[PDB]
Amino acid sequence: GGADHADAAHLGTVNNALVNHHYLEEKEFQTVAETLQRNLATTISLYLKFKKYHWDIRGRFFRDLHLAYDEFIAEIFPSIDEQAERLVALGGSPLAAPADLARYSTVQVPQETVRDARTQVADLVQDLSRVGKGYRDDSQACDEANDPVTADMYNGYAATIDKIRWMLQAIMDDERLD
Amino acid sequence: GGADHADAAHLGTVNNALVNHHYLEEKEFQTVAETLQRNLATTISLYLKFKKYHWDIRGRFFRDLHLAYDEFIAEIFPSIDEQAERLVALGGSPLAAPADLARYSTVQVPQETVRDARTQVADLVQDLSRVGKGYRDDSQACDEANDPVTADMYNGYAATIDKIRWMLQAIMDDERLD
Amino acid sequence: GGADHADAAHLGTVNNALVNHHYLEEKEFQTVAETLQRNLATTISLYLKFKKYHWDIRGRFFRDLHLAYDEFIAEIFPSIDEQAERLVALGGSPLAAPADLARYSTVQVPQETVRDARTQVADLVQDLSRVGKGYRDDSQACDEANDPVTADMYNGYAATIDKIRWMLQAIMDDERLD
Amino acid sequence: GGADHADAAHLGTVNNALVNHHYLEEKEFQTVAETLQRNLATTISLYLKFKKYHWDIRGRFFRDLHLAYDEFIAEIFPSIDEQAERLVALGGSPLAAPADLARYSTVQVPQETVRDARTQVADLVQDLSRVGKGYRDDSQACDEANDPVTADMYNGYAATIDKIRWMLQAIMDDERLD
Amino acid sequence: GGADHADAAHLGTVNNALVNHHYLEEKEFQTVAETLQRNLATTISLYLKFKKYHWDIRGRFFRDLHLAYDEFIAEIFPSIDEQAERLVALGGSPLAAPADLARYSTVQVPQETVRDARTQVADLVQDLSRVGKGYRDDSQACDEANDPVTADMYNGYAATIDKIRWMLQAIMDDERLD
Amino acid sequence: GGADHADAAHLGTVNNALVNHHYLEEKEFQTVAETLQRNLATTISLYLKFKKYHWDIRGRFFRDLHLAYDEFIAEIFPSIDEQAERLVALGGSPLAAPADLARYSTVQVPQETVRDARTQVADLVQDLSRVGKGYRDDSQACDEANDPVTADMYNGYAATIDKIRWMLQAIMDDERLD
Amino acid sequence: GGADHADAAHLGTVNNALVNHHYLEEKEFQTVAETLQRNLATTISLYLKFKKYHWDIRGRFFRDLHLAYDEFIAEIFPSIDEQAERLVALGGSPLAAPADLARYSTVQVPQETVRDARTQVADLVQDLSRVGKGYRDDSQACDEANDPVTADMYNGYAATIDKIRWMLQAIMDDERLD
Amino acid sequence: GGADHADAAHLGTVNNALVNHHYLEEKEFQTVAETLQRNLATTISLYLKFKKYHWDIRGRFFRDLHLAYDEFIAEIFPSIDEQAERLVALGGSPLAAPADLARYSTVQVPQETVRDARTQVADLVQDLSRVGKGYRDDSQACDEANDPVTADMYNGYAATIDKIRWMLQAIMDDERLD
Amino acid sequence: GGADHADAAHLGTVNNALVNHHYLEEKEFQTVAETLQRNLATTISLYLKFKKYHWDIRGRFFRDLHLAYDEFIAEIFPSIDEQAERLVALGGSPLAAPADLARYSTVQVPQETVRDARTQVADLVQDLSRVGKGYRDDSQACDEANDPVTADMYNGYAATIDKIRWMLQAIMDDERLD
Amino acid sequence: GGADHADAAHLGTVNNALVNHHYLEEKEFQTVAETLQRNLATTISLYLKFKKYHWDIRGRFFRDLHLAYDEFIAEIFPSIDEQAERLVALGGSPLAAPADLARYSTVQVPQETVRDARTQVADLVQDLSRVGKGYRDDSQACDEANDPVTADMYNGYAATIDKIRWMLQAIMDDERLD
Amino acid sequence: GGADHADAAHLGTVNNALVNHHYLEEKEFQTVAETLQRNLATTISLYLKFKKYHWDIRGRFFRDLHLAYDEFIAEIFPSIDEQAERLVALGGSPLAAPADLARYSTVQVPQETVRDARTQVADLVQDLSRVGKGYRDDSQACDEANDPVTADMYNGYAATIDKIRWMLQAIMDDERLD
Ligand SMILES: [Fe+3]
Ligand SMILES: [Fe+3]
Ligand SMILES: [Fe+3]
Ligand SMILES: [Zn+2]
Ligand SMILES: [Zn+2]
Ligand SMILES: [Zn+2]
Ligand SMILES: [Zn+2]
């Protein structure tokens, strides 16, 4: 299935003899675990991206954005452990190495210094549009895979992402922001 | 659709060029937004009604009810901002002016001084029966409209309302309460 | 007198036989109670207005104003219960239904979506100028009516309103704010 | 003057050579100090009375009143030290011995066991009517004696007493309370 | 002895070779341990009974009793772990399975729905009379068995139980409570 | 017996039909209740005395003693309610009126202004010597009367009083303190 | 008027077009603003003076005074921002540069090292006598100028200053303090 | 008597003229004070020993024991000041110098590095067996010497020590712990 | 030396006989003390300047800067007492009178009302550049003078100042800020 | 220089005209910035590695290590922002994208599932040995480059890393850990 | 080397095979470890000495010194664990047995009862002069031994000790203190 990279129930290793997918069938785990690993990688990447833009912003919107990004991080950060632990509970092993983040995240972290407010905000709004829709879609997929438990987690994460999206989109809805 | 009064995505105004309904189709937004504006108006109206009855109660059940209403307010109050912000996140604009509260709320706030414990409690129980069922129904409607995120909010609000309903209904289940 | 709408000491109802105006003469109560009901309605209306403008603001001053309005609400909100309870203590019954808010408030809550920073701020500054002067005048009136106790409440509320006024007026004292 | 019992500025004792009435003339101190000693004695007596009624109440309103009296004590208790220290600051010496409490308080503490809810509440409402009016009157007297500072203290204490009065009066406004 | 059911020092099992009765002689342990197991079972049963009556109460004393029972639980709950751990420290093994609770508790948890305030309160007062006297008697027994340490625990638990008893007995000392 | 003034179990009044002495025999209650009423009156009197000396101290030890007395009050104050409630739980009714404090307290509250550090401290040390020994003796008496529960309370109060005694006695063990 | 140095409503500068005196007439602002600027300068100067004496005190009263001065600072410090912001709210601009502090304060900060307890305390008592009377007088002046709001602030500040005065005056009322 | 080393009531020194044994006879003080000085020295020594074993433990039980010892220290540490102050209150002077700790403690602090889990735990269990029995015995001795107050302290300390003993003894009741 | 104005070890005054420079040689103290007095004066002046600019800012960056300055004050304020107390510990006496602040500070507090954001920020950035470099240089000087202790303090203060500098410099790095 | 990848002072971009290296010469910045970017990347990588090992550990040391890793994260996590912000303050731009973490970190985050306690711990101890020595060396380098401020940060981070190293090394110093 | 007594890296024992001196050469460890063991012993001894003097002080400076010593303990106490753990992290084993404290501490704990304020304070000032200089010297030695990390710890401890020294020295700089 589509989550082999995150599946730990079939490993040829020590201290692994009991690992299983609990109440999920194999294909159901594959569906759910693909979502959890992707969203975990995406969340960690949003932390890193919000931090890089918070460190790099300059100009007259510095206080607006520097502080906002830290508030947004505070909202999303607890979901890192929550998503990873859910995956573990279902018989997965979460990936968090840089190369794995890059492969599985739907959000790319900047390698350049972006000083420009509009450039940062527009980039983040595009990211959050994708991530929020992703959580809505992934909630429905999990529920269909007989995992209402993970879906419930995603419903809350989507609400948070959708809120952050609104705020950022509002800031940039302004022709005076160059 | 049935939420035109709450829809902000089509306004002929400034700083509005980016407003949209995110991952909802137009008709889905109409369904969800009608619920959010109604429930927002209802919640604010329940705050005002619990306060007016808390200010006006007299007689030997004063402490019982004066204090209970404040506890109930504390439970429901955070949902005002939550519901309004959800609507905003979906491309709506929440109405909160007195005339709009009166139009869209399913709960009417008293204009008279009601001293009588039974009169207050029976009125509130009828309100909470409607509001709790409303949140259950609205959760199902939102889920059907591809908005499990708003539905999830409503599932928690219904639990709270249903709890308050029980307590009030219990108090008045007594022939010695005139 | 001018506070009949707020006077509960003469009602033909149950559990009301002890209600009186304490140490105030009837005309003194009328003077004081007119102020308390008006200011209560105005305070609740300022809550609703600050919230609607906080929900509706867009553009590059979003963080400035969205956050400021919530801070201002936090400052004024406790006075809702304080003013209502003072009225009750003096033998009044506070009005809080939407229709009563609309009738007695000196502040109107918007029915339209106002995205524009300057429009919001200028409107609020005009409101706060009236409300702050209102509390100063009402303090003097209460003291003259032999109610230094209510006057003392109003002296603190005026200080808060006058502070908020300054901040908002400062933000808009700028030709670069369109 | 009428506060000789509370005046410490003229004592024939040690460590007293600097004691004076600060910015008050002698007659102004006499006016203000009579109020402070009386209200101090009254406040301490209300603590003791609320406690004795809280310890002695029985019957089906036990929770209502037992808990309410403790809440009321919490509201009034800080004024004991505040009133005493104000008197000291003005060159007085506060009296707090039992015999002095009995002489100067406007509230009498019960010597009998009063089990009856109505008896307790009616007694307390009569006390609080007198004490609240007393603080209003004493505020005006202090202001007239060029002590707006003490008056300001009294304005807050009156508000608290008047609130407690309302609540107790409301509880007993009920023919079903025997 | 009379505590064989609670004695763990003589078991034919693993990881038990060091278990002993510390400074108590065997017969002293038997005396003390009979008290600890009984009181543990009784305490857990009072938790369950206070909860069932808190869940089941209806009528006009709902707030009085619903809230009081939770307060009483908060007072007694810490003694569950304390009593169990004391038993363990003395070389016992506490019983907490339903069948063991039923056997050793001096308090029976209702199997029926008791809506009636008086029925609940009278039942609880009879229980608390027995339990409070039980702790006084058990304190004396422990002290006589050279265990002043356990006695000291019981002296505090008795004070708490005796307080709760007073409050409940006071509420029902009223012919108007049917 | 010697506690008739504190005994509420035999009153000809309402809402008193259930009052009893719990697990104490009548003579045991008389012994214990005499101690509780006396110590309650003494504790309240120590509050009032520490406050009067804290308000009245002058000279170069002002900070030492002004602050110490407040710390000592904080230590003893909770025992007021504890002792009163214990008496109530045993079928007594605590006396707290000024005349009753004066009659039953072993500590007299000053009616004069005592500016002198040594005079205050020496007076308090004599009081605390009596009160601490009183609690030790009263603990033994309660234990002998089959009330180890009240004795346990007194053991803690004695420790506190004995600590305060030490500190005050240490301060005055100095020929340079005039 | 007498507050031209503090008046910002007539400046020839940017971002100042809206500045006004709110509900005060020009002469009323002049009266009130002279008081606010003077008291602001005085408060800041008392902070600096309490700190310099706290840093410089030596000898056997070190703990008494070192700690007391910090407590007194904690009491007065919040009034710095409060007084400055009140002035701003009324259309003033507060002065806080060293030269302005020196000009407008009624309290002088020492330039020498004062080790001597009595010298420090006597100096501070003279300062606090002036400052406390100043706040009483300034409260009356503000009320007469139709600014009960500022007067109310001053009534609280006077109470605090008068308390600190008492404590310091008490410490030095002692011939054994050299 | 057997506590001459801890007795301060007979010293030929300054500032000692008031020191006495309060309500204890000389021989009673000797009995009680021998216990307090010994237990003080023992408690301080247990702090030092738990710390040295917490600093020195190595191997696979590092987290178990490193963290447990700190928890145990937190439980016993407050008794250092409590025991010392009790001794002072009774006219003793507590010894805390290294040589005095070594002489009077019943627990020896290691001078060697003990890496081995079993060696540490077995040593501590032997210590805690002695110390817990010591507090039980010392409680009985104090009560017999007419000091129920100190006995009460010891009853609580014994419970704590006996709890720690259980936990440590449980950890080592295992043949797989080498 | 260059710190005679801050040196208290050679004064002809009372209570000064023990004052010395601890482990510093005279010339080392002179070096270190010149830095401490200068930095103390500078820190206090930055408090006053941040406050004056926070009180005086107007225009559309009001929230950005008004709030930022208060945050910056919170970061630097604790160093006032720390630097003064370090000087005292080394045998100095800190100067804090207005005239001394003006003489020794490297930062000048405005005497005019500066409404303009850019003017304020550019002024502060120049100040913070000097102050941050000053702390780095002063750390090296203190370490060379055998005072690594003061140097360590300065290393932390420099980090804070350098952070504030960055933020302010970022805000003004914008041609749209006039 | 060796920090070109982290240097932001020479960028051809917007809102960058003021960026500089503060009090550091160019070569000094290069030295310091190479350390800050490397240590930032290493710290973030240690977060990710501690989390992956905390998510993946299985077997009988699960609680030991799962909980320890979270404690270690809590200790190191604040240094992420601190190190990044220091770099920014010096005219750098921190890199945090996955590819940049991988390039500049001295710690590699696992891509495989490591269940084995010893494998995890030995890997981490090797990492922490390098990182702790790295901070010591980097502190010396920064001090030599005239940046005692950054060195001071590193001195604290080294202490933390060295502590964590000890604990982990202790756990694995055991032949019974396979 | 001079720290053999504190060196654990060469022991012939279990669970010690990995112990080493991290990034320090053997002679560097010897230098640093001699300081850590000495300062650990000294810190623990200052705890014990401050406590013994706090328990033993009598006379009119009782409150001054009793409370001050506890404040000073609170400042120094955390350094006990910090210094011990640093030693452990470097491959040492801290000594804390009484005999080891006595051998390695630079501060002697009294074996006699010292009632006299001046005697206590003068003794402590001599101790703190030595200990503060010791930390300054030891910081320099550690830095020279390539351990800036330990030096940094010592720089903070010296500041604390030097502060306490000042306060105590100030108290005794007074001929009226006998
Ligand atoms: Fe009730
Ligand atoms: Fe902004
Ligand atoms: Fe003193
Ligand atoms: Zn699988
Ligand atoms: Zn639409
Ligand atoms: Zn009327
Ligand atoms: Zn007089």
Ligand SMILES: [Zn+2]
């Ligand atoms: Zn057995």
Ligand SMILES: [Zn+2]
């Ligand atoms: Zn009786």
Ligand SMILES: [Zn+2]
């Ligand atoms: Zn003007």
Ligand SMILES: [Zn+2]
């Ligand atoms: Zn003796």
Ligand SMILES: [Zn+2]
């Ligand atoms: Zn010098």
Ligand SMILES: [Zn+2]
């Ligand atoms: Zn560069």
Ligand SMILES: [Zn+2]
């Ligand atoms: Zn070695």
